[PDB]
Structure 1
Amino acid sequence: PVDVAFGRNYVPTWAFDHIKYFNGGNEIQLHLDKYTGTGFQSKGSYLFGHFSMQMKLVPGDSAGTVTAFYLSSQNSEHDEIDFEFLGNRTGQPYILQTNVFTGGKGDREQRIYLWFDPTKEFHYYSVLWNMYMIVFLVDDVPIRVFKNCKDLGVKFPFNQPMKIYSSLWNADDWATRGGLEKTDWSKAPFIASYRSFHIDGCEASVEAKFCATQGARWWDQKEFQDLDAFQYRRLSWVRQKYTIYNYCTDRSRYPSMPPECKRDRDI
């Protein structure tokens, strides 16, 4: 991933004065207070690609805040690929929640702890999205895989171009300890920081709805049909030691296991 300026790829969409630009827009901060959070979105829409952001999360007390970095399409029956960082009281750990929506249906939450303090330094958070799979990455570690299993009747984000979004907002009702820890507004502003702003994708308008170089990009090559054995072992380590909630192994909500699990090694 190569670092460009914010304004090359992104525009603010709410509370313009709550986004602070540093070094020509090579670093930005989103601020949240009791009146408003803020958010931004990509200028373009994409069908497949590699999307990456360096982020450094809200330090100190971040209880009740959610910082989200996600791709979403725009019509009804929407597709969406989500990172949501759920903050905590001081000295208590963030959760990284992921989710995938297909045809308007989500409910595929997974939640992990991280193997570093996400407030102390910038780390990469990335999505690789091709016709074969979606991989969520934290730096070079795969934390989740969602495979294209249309052959088993399961939906996959396949023909709806998506924009990239990010935002910082309060979510008192559910973010921290299921909603027990409320935001301490005397500790505002809550500040999330961003760099890199990397977009390498198939540009495909909401109107035209397709990209001319499709099937021929570097992420369409055979090396990217699956993770290799080393990447799968990293993933299983995330699964075994860092995972606190997984919809795949949740048999109370999902009596009939999600067809994708065995392929994705979420089991």
Structure 2
Amino acid sequence: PVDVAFGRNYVPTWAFDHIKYFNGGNEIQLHLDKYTGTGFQSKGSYLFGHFSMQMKLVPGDSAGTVTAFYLSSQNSEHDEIDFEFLGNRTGQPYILQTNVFTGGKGDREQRIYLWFDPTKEFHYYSVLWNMYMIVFLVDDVPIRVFKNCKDLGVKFPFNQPMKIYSSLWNADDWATRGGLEKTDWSKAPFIASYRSFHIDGCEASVEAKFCATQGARWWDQKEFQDLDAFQYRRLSWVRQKYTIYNYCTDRSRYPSMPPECKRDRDI
């Protein structure tokens, strides 16, 4: 990931005055108070690529807040790849929730705790999205893989260009302790910080759902068809030690377990 200024790749979409720009936009702060949160989105749309953000989450009491960094297509039957950071009362742990929507259908939530305090320093949160798989990374650690399992009849984000989005907003009904902990608005403003703003992707308009260099990109090469053994060991550790919720092993919601799971090593 190469660090660039916000304005190279992104535009604000809501509550422009709630985005504070530092060092020429090399760092931004998103602010949330009782009237409004805020968000931004990429200027371009992409079909496959490598997308990365450095983030430092809301310090102190962040209960009820969600800081999101995600890719989404536009139409109905949408595809989406999500990082959703769920805050907490002071000194209680953040959750990093991930999710994948295909053809308008999600319900693929996983929730992890992190192996560092995400409010203390900036860390990298990244998506690698190619025709074979989607990988979610925290720094150099893969925390989830969503493989292209079209051969098993599972849909995959495959031809809908997506924009990159980020936002900070209240989500009282479900964010903290499943919705039991409500935002304490006397602790506003809640501030999330971002750097890097890295986009390396196959630019593709909604107009045309194609990129003229498809298959010729570095992420289309053979080495990116799968994670290597080292990366899978790091992933298994996240699965065994840091995962508090995993749609794959949730037999109450999925008596009929999803086909991707064994392949993704979420089993």
Calculate the TM-score normalised by the size of structure 1.
Answer: 1.00
Deviation for aligned residue 1:257:
1.3
* Paired positions, count: 267
Following TM superposition, where does structure 1 have runs of at least 4 consecutive aligned residues deviating by more than 3 angstroms?
A: none
CA distance in 1, matches of 2:226, 2:256: 25
CA distance in 2, matches of 1:206, 1:253: 34
Deviation for aligned residue 1:256:
1.4
Deviation for aligned residue 1:209:
1.6
- Please give the per-residue CA displacement for 1:43-72, whole angstroms capped at 9, x wherever unaligned: 000000000000000000000000000000
CA distance in 2, matches of 1:177, 1:31: 23
Deviation for aligned residue 1:113:
0.1
CA distance in 2, matches of 1:215, 1:260: 24
Deviation for aligned residue 1:186:
0.7
Deviation for aligned residue 1:208:
1.6
Cα RMSD after superposing both structures: 0.4
Deviation for aligned residue 1:109:
0.2
Identical-residue share of aligned pairs (%)? 100
Q: Is 2:255 aligned against 1:255?
A: yes
More moved, 90-99 vs 172-181 = 172-181
1:182: which partner in 2?
182
What secondary structure sits across from 1:232 in the alignment? helix
Deviation for aligned residue 1:157:
0.2
CA distance in 1, matches of 2:257, 2:52: 30
2:99: which partner in 1?
99
Deviation for aligned residue 1:252:
1.0
CA distance in 1, matches of 2:234, 2:112: 14
- Please give the per-residue CA displacement for 1:65-98, whole angstroms capped at 9, x wherever unaligned: 0000000000010000000000000000000000
What secondary structure sits across from 1:237 in the alignment? helix
CA distance in 2, matches of 1:229, 1:209: 34
Deviation for aligned residue 1:225:
0.3
More moved, 48-57 vs 250-259 = 250-259
Deviation for aligned residue 1:163:
0.0
- Please give the per-residue CA displacement for 1:107-146, whole angstroms capped at 9, x wherever unaligned: 0000000000000000000000000000000000000000
CA distance in 2, matches of 1:169, 1:152: 36
What secondary structure sits across from 2:17 in the alignment? helix
Q: Which runs of 5+ in 1 are unaligned?
A: none
What secondary structure sits across from 1:236 in the alignment? helix
